Amino acid sequence: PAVNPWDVLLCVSGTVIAGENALVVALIASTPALRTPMFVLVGSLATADLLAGLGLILHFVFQYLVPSETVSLLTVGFLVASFAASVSSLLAITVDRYLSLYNPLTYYSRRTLLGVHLLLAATWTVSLGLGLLPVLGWNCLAERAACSVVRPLARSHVALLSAAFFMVFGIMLHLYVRICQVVWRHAADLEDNWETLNDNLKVIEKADNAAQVKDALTKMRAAALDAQKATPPKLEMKDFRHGFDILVGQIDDALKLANEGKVKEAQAAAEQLKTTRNAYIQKYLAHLAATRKGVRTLAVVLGTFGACWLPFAIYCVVGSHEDPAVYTYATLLPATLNSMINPIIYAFRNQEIQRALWLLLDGC
Numbered sequence: 001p002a003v004n005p006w007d008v009l010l011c012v013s014g015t016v017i018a019g020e021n022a023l024v025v026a027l028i029a030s031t032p033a034l035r036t037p038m039f040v041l042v043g044s045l046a047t048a049d050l051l052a053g054l055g056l057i058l059h060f061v062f063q064y065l066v067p068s069e070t071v072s073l074l075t076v077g078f079l080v081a082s083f084a085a086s087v088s089s090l091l092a093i094t095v096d097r098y099l100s101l102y103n104p105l106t107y108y109s110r111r112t113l114l115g116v117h118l119l120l121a122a123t124w125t126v127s128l129g130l131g132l133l134p135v136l137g138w139n140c141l142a143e144r145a146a147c148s149v150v151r152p153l154a155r156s157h158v159a160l161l162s163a164a165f166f167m168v169f170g171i172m173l174h175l176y177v178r179i180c181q182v183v184w185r186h187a188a189d190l191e192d193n194w195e196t197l198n199d200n201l202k203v204i205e206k207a208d209n210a211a212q213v214k215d216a217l218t219k220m221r222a223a224a225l226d227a228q229k230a231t232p233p234k235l236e237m238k239d240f241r242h243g244f245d246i247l248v249g250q251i252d253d254a255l256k257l258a259n260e261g262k263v264k265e266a267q268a269a270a271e272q273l274k275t276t277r278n279a280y281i282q283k284y285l286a287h288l289a290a291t292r293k294g295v296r297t298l299a300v301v302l303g304t305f306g307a308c309w310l311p312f313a314i315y316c317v318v319g320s321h322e323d324p325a326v327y328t329y330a331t332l333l334p335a336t337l338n339s340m341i342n343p344i345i346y347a348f349r350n351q352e353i354q355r356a357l358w359l360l361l362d363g364c
């Protein structure tokens with residue numbers, strides 16, 4: 001028993017990672033529709049995870065099948081660059097999601113596409129550099145007292161890697177809270193205006209004087225428009241939104257009658273407003289149910305990223321080369337599992353990626 005079980009587990013993990021992310025890469029590459037900034041970023045993440053998966057397999061190969069210290073230095077440097085590129089790609093994705101939420105219009109501009117190009121060129125340039133430094137000689141091959149828990153990386157180089165991870169993670173947390181903030185605000189405004197919409201509709205049905213009817217119709221018009229704004233836009237869906245378009249229209253019809261002195265007729269028009277409102281009551285509950293689920297996903301995915309990488313990042317600066325290798329393996333394996341989760345969260349859950357997959361399975 002000279003093969004270490006953990007090395008086999010990493011090879012298995014790398015195989016799953018490579019297979020998952022190779023499929024994502026193939027789907028985006030062969031689908032001209034998937035060329036927006038968002039998908040350029042997903043393709044970068046998938047490529048990095050693909051490279052990291054292959055790297056785990058290669059590390060096994062040149063440890064056990066072609067024993068080579070030199071090529072093992074290359075494989076570890078390869079993995080440093082691949083995981084750096086994956087973590088930095090997650091940062092870039094998060095930046096993009098922030099910008100699309102905070103700039104519902106100016107996000108769709110030439111600057112945004114330029115920004116992804118420059119950001120990815122920079123993250124990949126830095127990622128490669130980080131893996132190239134040990135290959136060029138910033139390693140512990142000469143001085144074994146300077147070895148980190150991941151051979152043959154030098155403790156000082158690994159400290160830099162962990163510092164970069166902590167900074168990247170801190171930025172993601174900042175963006176996460178801002179994203180969370182915007183999603184909560186819009187959901188709160190939608191639920192507010194929807195409730196006031198219903199309140200005034202009851203005022204109409206129970207009105208006893210004409211002043212109440214006009215007042216309630218005036219508030220319904222404002223609430224309808226505010227509820228529309230809080231709904232995310234179609235693109236660059238708008239069916240739930242267009243439900244408010246015909247509500248404003250009906251409210252304007254009732255207001256016209258009320259202003260001409262036909263308040264009885266304006267009140268009776270609430271039956272039609274209640275009919276309209278009831279038709280979109282499910283789309284409203286479904287939208288609130290989707291945002292709720294999305295918020296949960298946000299936190300779960302970021303928490304899982306932290307649970308997978310933080311123990312490793314911490315142990316890499318606290319541990320030393322004297323520790324048994326199992327503690328490096330036990331903290332490294334979860335970090336690799338995150339590269340199995342990434343394609344599911346950022347690629348396979350996307351409807352356009354699923355469509356490309358359907359066209360691929362069905363022979364186009």
Ligand SMILES: CC(C)CCC[C@@H](C)[C@H]1CC[C@H]2[C@@H]3CC=C4C[C@@H](O)CC[C@]4(C)[C@H]3CC[C@]12C
Nearest residue numbers: 039040041043044047051078081082085120124
């Ligand atoms: C040690 C490893 C990391 C070296 C990797 C070298 C090559 C293969 C890397 C470096 C930069 C990478 C590119 C950077 C960004 C993108 C955009 C993405 O939408 C598709 C993949 C693509 C086009 C990558 C393809 C692979 C790539 C060219």
Ligand SMILES: CCCCCCCC/C=C\CCCCCCCC(=O)OC[C@H](O)CO
Nearest residue numbers: 018019020022023024026027030360363364
């Ligand atoms: C020996 C171990 C097994 C190695 C062998 C399995 C490797 C699977 C990896 C990636 C497959 C997903 C990427 C390929 C997806 C198809 C590429 C494509 O676009 O094909 C279009 C064509 O119409 C259809 O063949």
Ligand SMILES: CCCCCCCC/C=C\CCCCCCCC(=O)OC[C@H](O)CO
Nearest residue numbers: 066067068069071074077078081131132135
């Ligand atoms: C991250 C930056 C570093 C990335 C580095 C990627 C380098 C890959 C390039 C070429 C393949 C080289 C393959 C070398 C195959 C060597 C086969 C061999 O003979 O090596 C066994 C040797 O004899 C034992 O004694």
Ligand SMILES: CCCCCCCC/C=C\CCCCCCCC(=O)OC[C@H](O)CO
Nearest residue numbers: 091095098099126130163164165167168171
């Ligand atoms: C060895 C090197 C290690 C480096 C370790 C540190 C990593 C973090 C550095 C840069 C990421 C910057 C990402 C962009 C930050 C957010 C930009 C943003 O939100 O602003 C966009 C602006 O508002 C548009 O108008």
Ligand SMILES: CCCCCCCC/C=C\CCCCCCCC(=O)OC[C@H](O)CO
Nearest residue numbers: 304307308311312324326327330331334337
């Ligand atoms: C989302 C999933 C997140 C998963 C996060 C996992 C974090 C694992 C961290 C520590 C486990 C350490 C396990 C160490 C097992 C040691 C067994 C033992 O006794 O070691 C023998 C050794 O020779 C005597 O030093």
Ligand SMILES: CCCCCCCC/C=C\CCCCCCCC(=O)O
Nearest residue numbers: 001004005006008009010012013016
């Ligand atoms: C989806 C792919 C299937 C994954 C199955 C899991 C792969 C398990 C591979 C290696 C695990 C090694 C188990 C360790 C055996 C005991 C080792 C020992 O006692 O020395």
Ligand SMILES: CCCCCCCC/C=C\CCCCCCCC(=O)O
Nearest residue numbers: 025028029043047050051054055058
């Ligand atoms: C044996 C060395 C291990 C490295 C293997 C390298 C093979 C994978 C390299 C790149 C795959 C990424 C291809 C990206 C295609 C995207 C095209 C597009 O976005 O339009």
Ligand SMILES: CCCCCCCC/C=C\CCCCCCCC(=O)O
Nearest residue numbers: 018053054055057058061062065066
């Ligand atoms: C593009 C698919 C992924 C390819 C990289 C991962 C799989 C491993 C591929 C090749 C491993 C063998 C490399 C060549 C070994 C030569 C040994 C020798 O010449 O003595």
Ligand SMILES: CCCCCCCC/C=C\CCCCCCCC(=O)O
Nearest residue numbers: 125126128129130132133136137138
């Ligand atoms: C993408 C950039 C990659 C290179 C970044 C570094 C640039 C500076 C040039 C050379 C320094 C790299 C080598 C440092 C370790 C030397 C160890 C030694 O000589 O024994």
Ligand SMILES: CCCCCCCC/C=C\CCCCCCCC(=O)O
Nearest residue numbers: 129133136137138139140142154156
């Ligand atoms: C802002 C981009 C900067 C690009 C240039 C960066 C150049 C980096 C060069 C060297 C980094 C430090 C390398 C340390 C080598 C130590 C060698 C050893 O310990 O034996």
Ligand SMILES: CCCCCCCC/C=C\CCCCCCCC(=O)O
Nearest residue numbers: 079149150151161162165313316325
């Ligand atoms: C995130 C900051 C922590 C430092 C990151 C280090 C990145 C190294 C990545 C892959 C190298 C994996 C090599 C295989 C583990 C062997 C462990 C051992 O030395 O016994």
Ligand SMILES: CCCCCCCC/C=C\CCCCCCCC(=O)O
Nearest residue numbers: 155156159162163166167169170317
């Ligand atoms: C998740 C919270 C993010 C907070 C980021 C704080 C800034 C992090 C920057 C540097 C800290 C890492 C320095 C590690 C040095 C260890 C050296 C050693 O003992 O080998």
Ligand SMILES: CCCCCCCC/C=C\CCCCCCCC(=O)O
Nearest residue numbers: 004005006009324325326327329333
């Ligand atoms: C048994 C399949 C495991 C599936 C993934 C979960 C990983 C944790 C379970 C087992 C780890 C591999 C076996 C540990 C070998 C102990 C000997 C050693 O430390 O080198």
